[PDB]
Amino acid sequence: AAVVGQEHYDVASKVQETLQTYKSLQDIIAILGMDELSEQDKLTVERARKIQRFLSQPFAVAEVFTGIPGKLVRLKDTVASFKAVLEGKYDNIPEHAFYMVGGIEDVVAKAEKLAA
Amino acid sequence: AAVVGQEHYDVASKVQETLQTYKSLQDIIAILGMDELSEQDKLTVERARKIQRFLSQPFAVAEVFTGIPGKLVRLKDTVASFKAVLEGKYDNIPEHAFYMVGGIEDVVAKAEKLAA
Amino acid sequence: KLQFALPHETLYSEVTQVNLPAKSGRIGVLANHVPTVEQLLPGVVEVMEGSNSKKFFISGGFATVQPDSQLCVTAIEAPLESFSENIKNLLAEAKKNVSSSREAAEAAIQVEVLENLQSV
Amino acid sequence: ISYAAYLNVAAQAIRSTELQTASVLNRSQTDAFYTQYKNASEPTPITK
Amino acid sequence: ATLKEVEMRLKSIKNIEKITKTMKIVASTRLSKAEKAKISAKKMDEAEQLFYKNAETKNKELIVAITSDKGLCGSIHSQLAKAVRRHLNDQPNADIVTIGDKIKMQLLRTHPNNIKLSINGIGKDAPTFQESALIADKLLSVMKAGTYPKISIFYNDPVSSLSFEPSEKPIFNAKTIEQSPSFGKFEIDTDANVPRDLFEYTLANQMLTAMAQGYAAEISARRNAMDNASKNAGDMINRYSILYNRTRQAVITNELVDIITGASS
Amino acid sequence: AEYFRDEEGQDVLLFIDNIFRFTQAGSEVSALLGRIPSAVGYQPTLATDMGLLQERITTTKKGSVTSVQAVYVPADDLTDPAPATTFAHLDATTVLSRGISELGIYPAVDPLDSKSRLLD
Amino acid sequence: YVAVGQKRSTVAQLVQTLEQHDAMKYSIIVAATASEAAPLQYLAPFTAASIGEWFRDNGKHALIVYDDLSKQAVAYRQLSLLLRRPPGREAYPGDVFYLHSRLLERAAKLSEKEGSGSLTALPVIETQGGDVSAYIPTNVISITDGQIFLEAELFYKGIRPAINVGLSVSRVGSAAQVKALKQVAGSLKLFLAQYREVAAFAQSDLDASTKQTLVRGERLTQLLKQNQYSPLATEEQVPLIYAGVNGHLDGIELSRIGEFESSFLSYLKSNHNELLTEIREKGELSKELLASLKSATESFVAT
Amino acid sequence: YVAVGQKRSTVAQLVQTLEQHDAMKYSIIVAATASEAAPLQYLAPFTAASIGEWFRDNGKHALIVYDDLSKQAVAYRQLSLLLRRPPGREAYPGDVFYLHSRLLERAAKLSEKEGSGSLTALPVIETQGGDVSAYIPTNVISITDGQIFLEAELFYKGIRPAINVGLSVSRVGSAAQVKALKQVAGSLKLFLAQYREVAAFAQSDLDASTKQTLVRGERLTQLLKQNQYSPLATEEQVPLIYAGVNGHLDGIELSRIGEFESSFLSYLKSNHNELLTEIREKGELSKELLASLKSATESFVAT
Amino acid sequence: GSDLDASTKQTLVRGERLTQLLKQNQYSPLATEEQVPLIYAGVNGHLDGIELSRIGEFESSFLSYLKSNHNELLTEIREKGELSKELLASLKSATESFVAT
């Protein structure tokens, strides 16, 4: 929290917690099925599946592989963009509109694209 | 298939597949019950239980040890027997009926014995 | 005797006089009474066992004097005091609703309930 | 529409002063969809 | 390798065990409320039934059956399915109304022709008058229930706290009510709409009770099943534990032998 | 103990601490002696060394030693050779438990868990 | 009785037990206790088998119990390791197979030429941690003919001793049996491997046929049970098995099975020990003996 | 602090952190860095202990933290194998137990003859994957009395520092812990024990008792989080645990627990740092202090 | 699982067909020219509708059908070794036509 600032730290703690919860709940969802897992849990899970695919982001040297031109986003910008996800302002955005794209702006654009 | 006839190979393929399903569902069978298996699967499981029991064929040199007279079953007869079982033709009879007896004709006859 | 019973309650599942609002107007059942089956209209109900009286606001139901002097009253949900001002406000809105929209009958029933409530 | 549907509406009306409890409120709010089936065939799961 | 693949599998079994324990307890918790409800409901039912008995109400047809959306609540689904099938040999052309998905799937396979009305969203909640009333209202309007002068409903009677026997009962049509003889030993006006009302009222009252009886059996079955699950899982813990211990020892020994062989050279 | 038994005739009781650490000490001495270690590391002379220790404890005409040993089972594996060899020598096992002690029972001894071959 | 690797105290109690049952006079004891040195233990079964062979080579019938060969394995292991021969699997030396096999095959029913010698071998294997796939045990199993696996769960669970019969085989055993004890016991092994199946799937719907099998099976299991140092005569065993086979233990409620056994035996002797004498000498059941037993068993069942 | 096999950069960071908190002026760092040779590594904990002896002998007190003996083991392996000493379990030297035991017993709380010059010690052992079965861990666990078992899941779950107290023990126990803190944390042990048992629930209908445990338990767990490199005084240990014991924290929402902690402390400092200092100096919670404190906690809870 | 999404069961239905599609008869290799149609059909979900059991029969027949009618198309797939918009459409149409076998 000193090295990368309190905001970065807090944001990252929230991401980590969200994911750790998701993994912990993953077993429960596996057998029991997601239904009796809380409304709060559902929002956390929904964010986690989205965050999981928000991490995804093509690379230029995987035009060889994926065939998608690379995207590299500034660190400061990334902190902001992930912050947005946690705030849940984009929890109306489809999961696949987070998949394999860059920044929040791109996610929004891909939401519009998928919408069309 | 070429070597021992396509029909034999097809029959054998189905037996292998069926038994593999049964092996696969060994986990579910133990962890849960049998009723918690899907109905479609439950038919397969019942068939497979029959197939396993069908495979026990007394040996003549072991006739003493088993206490059951041995059974020598023709290759053509064997193919017939499995063919039927896969089509569930005679399936509707005890798994004890299938147990320790020779060919399909013997199974059919032993069903009468058990039925009494 | 008497059974005043409901799915989620068994109020008075002895009882001497019961005063009921019924399709036959208002009915009182006292000791031996003729063996009847009458659907209770939406209601203000008083049940008296001795002189002591308990007052229920009742969603209507059915009433049946049984020939064994068991007054089976069955209704969906009742205390009068629990039912009964804010409700009068809501019902006013519901009266408006009949104007716009089976729903006409539903809102009409709500107006009937408002009359019954006004009785309370 | 049925006589008991009338009574149903009345019961719902009866859960309207303010002295109410959750179990009462729950008894008058429920979610379901009657999927009118047909002869395989099946008109949609239209909300009850 | 062996050791790690054993270890993860044993861990899986452990997680299953923990879940089956947790679930079983929660099932017990849910069961207490369920039973409480069923008493009050049943008491109400008995009062109406008192009329029907004293009336001696007597008797295409309808078959109504109930088994929740949710599963893993014993053999409620399939014992009821078997008993529906039995009574579907009593009239092949009877119209089956399936209240909840689980019974819907099984019967739909057995005859898909007969599935006419079905209801979703049942399994989620513990039975309520609101549900029963609407299902009934729709049974009358949609299925024109009165046309079929035989109505019969199936449910699971929770016979004992460890048992459930699938059960059926006959819902009394207005025609039955009309022509029952000791209907005449009760009295109300001829200008009353009471046959047509009384039919409707007990269509729902019986149905709510049937649902309540079923629900209690369902939650009870889930408790029983999850308990039996804990036992089955425990046995698997023990079997893999012995495997784990043996495997662990074997690895130590085999590796050691290699080290020794190297030193010996 | 043997001076007590043989030369004072007394019946005496000799406590030992971890016999796991008896085994551990022995395994090391073998390894130092350069002998090829036997299964699960333990000395090749595991059986004989324990054998000498637990056959010098007995009821002679003169007296009898009796020995209480503490078995610190490694990894709680009763399949492990160090426990196994111990269990061969043992006649009875007294199984103290903390669950039982938490029931307020002092003796700490868990009665069902304890098993004896001296109970016959 | 070869006692290898056993507490010298315990062996002395055993010896005293044998002398209590006055059995010492018909028996030899070879002893190689836990205290006794590992090379002595290595040579201990072999020497014992030599002693047995003198009787055998008189043509006389004999028996040798090698208790416990599992302790011989540990001994040969120690010896091998101290001879720094390469450690085999599970640290049991690579020549361990040869050790057991050379020992085991020196016992046998000789031919008429050799004066029909016999040395009955019963080698007693101690499964470490009850591992029935352990290297030394599997190696022994392959050498030996039949195994008499005993089940710990059953031992704790109310049979002392508890002879599991599911995992007990005897490769050629049935040909040496008395014809009576083949006839009365006909298919009872099969029946109780139907009981095994029945109780496998009992834990579920039960057909009345299945219930009948279960009732016979459970009750038969009770009948098998016996308590340590209480043996039964060959003659005595024949009717008891006849009863159970002939389903007379459906006739006895589970609680009273023990009563049935003792009472039945007392009854049989009192009713007619003539029958038992016949089964003792004839050693087979004629049609008359079968009927006489059917009649007699029915007679006891009534009382 | 005995830095064994640690990157010189890492130890430089340690030095810097220590300098940052101005702790070098009672700190001693025996340094055997990752690059440093295996003889130096072998003798490094021994050497460190010797430094400690001077303090201990002088009757003063000290704390020696051996970090990490797991790397001491590897170095001993390197020495032994290269010296062609016979290998042993897990390719660790045979006398590795002997090494560890020699080191670990030199820590001591002397007799009153020697003025009880303590030499508290805290060895650190690194678990390969939580493999307590591993030879070097098993040995050390036996040698030491007490364990602290940190848990990775907890770390991820934001309990930083993460101590899994299910697997932590202190055999020293009540010999340590101030009387005041013992009083107000006996309750804490029992509550937490329940929270662990009631951790299984996390699903429908959850009993009020269970729910009371869950709420109280979650708040307690939240209370025990600590910002690394910020320690808290005993006079602040006592209020915080007291609140938790009194269930005064149970009401406070989870997000506000953290805020509650610092605020409560400042509130206590403003309102009555007399109480805190009194608690500190008495070291035993007087009923009058528990009274005043109870009032104070309530007062803070209200705000 | 105590609940199965319709979407997951769409996947499940498609997936099952794909597994059957993958299978190939031992000692019988198959030309790439005739692997391009089959994979197109599968990926464009044509086979999803076609029942699971008869996928193998369908595969055999489909090839025969393309050999009969769209042998011009097959020649192009071979010849150009890439698929143009037009060729993809031709192929798409052909597949659509054979969905109704």
UniProtKB/Swiss-Prot annotation, chain C:
Entry annotated with the keyword Ribonucleoprotein: no
A GO biological process held by the record: proton motive force-driven ATP synthesis
Superkingdom, taxonomy of origin: Eukaryota
A molecular function GO annotation: proton-transporting ATP synthase activity, rotational mechanism
UniProt keyword annotation of Secreted present: no
Main location: mitochondrion
Keywords: ATP synthesis, CF(1), Hydrogen ion transport, Ion transport, Membrane, Mitochondrion, Mitochondrion inner membrane, Transit peptide, Transport
Compartments in which it is found: Mitochondrion; Mitochondrion inner membrane
GO cellular component: mitochondrial inner membrane; mitochondrion; proton-transporting ATP synthase complex
Function according to Swiss-Prot or TrEMBL: Mitochondrial membrane ATP synthase (F(1)F(0) ATP synthase or Complex V) produces ATP from ADP in the presence of a proton gradient across the membrane which is generated by electron transport complexes of the respiratory chain. F-type ATPases consist of two structural domains, F(1) - containing the extramembraneous catalytic core, and F(0) - containing the membrane proton channel, linked together by a central stalk and a peripheral stalk. During catalysis, ATP turnover in the catalytic domain of F(1) is coupled via a rotary mechanism of the central stalk subunits to proton translocation.
Family affiliation: Belongs to the ATPase epsilon chain family.
Name assigned to this protein: ATP synthase subunit delta, mitochondrial
Source organism of the structure: Saccharomyces cerevisiae (strain ATCC 204508 / S288c)
Gene: ATP16
UniProtKB/Swiss-Prot annotation, chain D:
Quaternary structure, from the entry: F-type ATPases have 2 components, CF(1) - the catalytic core - and CF(0) - the membrane proton channel. CF(1) has five subunits: alpha(3), beta(3), gamma(1), delta(1), epsilon(1). CF(0) has three main subunits: a, b and c.
Residue stretches in coiled coil: none
Note: Present with 4280 molecules/cell in log phase SD medium.
Listed Gene3D superfamilies: ATP synthase, F1 complex, epsilon subunit superfamily, mitochondrial (1.10.1620.20)
Keyword Ion transport: yes
Keywords linked to the UniProt accession: ATP synthesis, CF(1), Hydrogen ion transport, Ion transport, Membrane, Mitochondrion, Mitochondrion inner membrane, Phosphoprotein, Transport
Signal peptide: none
Taxonomic lineage: Eukaryota, Fungi, Dikarya, Ascomycota, Saccharomycotina
GO cellular component, one term: proton-transporting ATP synthase complex
Function: Mitochondrial membrane ATP synthase (F(1)F(0) ATP synthase or Complex V) produces ATP from ADP in the presence of a proton gradient across the membrane which is generated by electron transport complexes of the respiratory chain. F-type ATPases consist of two structural domains, F(1) - containing the extramembraneous catalytic core, and F(0) - containing the membrane proton channel, linked together by a central stalk and a peripheral stalk. During catalysis, ATP synthesis in the catalytic domain of F(1) is coupled via a rotary mechanism of the central stalk subunits to proton translocation.
Name of the protein in question: ATP synthase subunit epsilon, mitochondrial
Curated annotation (Swiss-Prot), chain F:
Subcellular location: Mitochondrion; Mitochondrion inner membrane
Top-level taxon in the UniProt lineage: Eukaryota
Claim: Metal-binding is one of the keywords in the record: no
GO CC annotations, alphabetized: cytosol; mitochondrial inner membrane; mitochondrial intermembrane space; mitochondrion; proton-transporting ATP synthase complex
Keywords, sorted A to Z: ATP synthesis, ATP-binding, CF(1), Hydrogen ion transport, Ion transport, Membrane, Mitochondrion, Mitochondrion inner membrane, Nucleotide-binding, Phosphoprotein, Transit peptide, Translocase, Transport
Gene Ontology molecular functions: ATP binding; ATP hydrolysis activity; proton-transporting ATP synthase activity, rotational mechanism; proton-transporting ATPase activity, rotational mechanism
Positions carrying Phosphoserine: 101
Biological process according to GO: proton motive force-driven ATP synthesis; proton motive force-driven mitochondrial ATP synthesis
Family that this chain belongs to: Belongs to the ATPase alpha/beta chains family.
Assembly, per entry: F-type ATPases have 2 components, CF(1) - the catalytic core - and CF(0) - the membrane proton channel. CF(1) has five subunits: alpha(3), beta(3), gamma(1), delta(1), epsilon(1). CF(0) has three main subunits: a, b and c.
Note: Present with 164000 molecules/cell in log phase SD medium.
The protein's name in its UniProt record: ATP synthase subunit beta, mitochondrial
Entire protein: shown range: 273 to 392 of 511
From Swiss-Prot, chain I:
Assigned protein family: Belongs to the ATPase alpha/beta chains family.
Leftover remarks: Present with 41500 molecules/cell in log phase SD medium.
Highest taxon listed in the record's lineage: Eukaryota
Compartment annotation: Mitochondrion inner membrane
Quaternary state and interactors: F-type ATPases have 2 components, CF(1) - the catalytic core - and CF(0) - the membrane proton channel. CF(1) has five subunits: alpha(3), beta(3), gamma(1), delta(1), epsilon(1). CF(0) has three main subunits: a, b and c.
Described purpose of this protein according to its UniProt entry: Mitochondrial membrane ATP synthase (F(1)F(0) ATP synthase or Complex V) produces ATP from ADP in the presence of a proton gradient across the membrane which is generated by electron transport complexes of the respiratory chain. F-type ATPases consist of two structural domains, F(1) - containing the extramembraneous catalytic core, and F(0) - containing the membrane proton channel, linked together by a central stalk and a peripheral stalk. During catalysis, ATP synthesis in the catalytic domain of F(1) is coupled via a rotary mechanism of the central stalk subunits to proton translocation.
Span within the parent record: 444 to 544 of 545
Gene field: ATP1
Name of the protein this chain belongs to: ATP synthase subunit alpha, mitochondrial
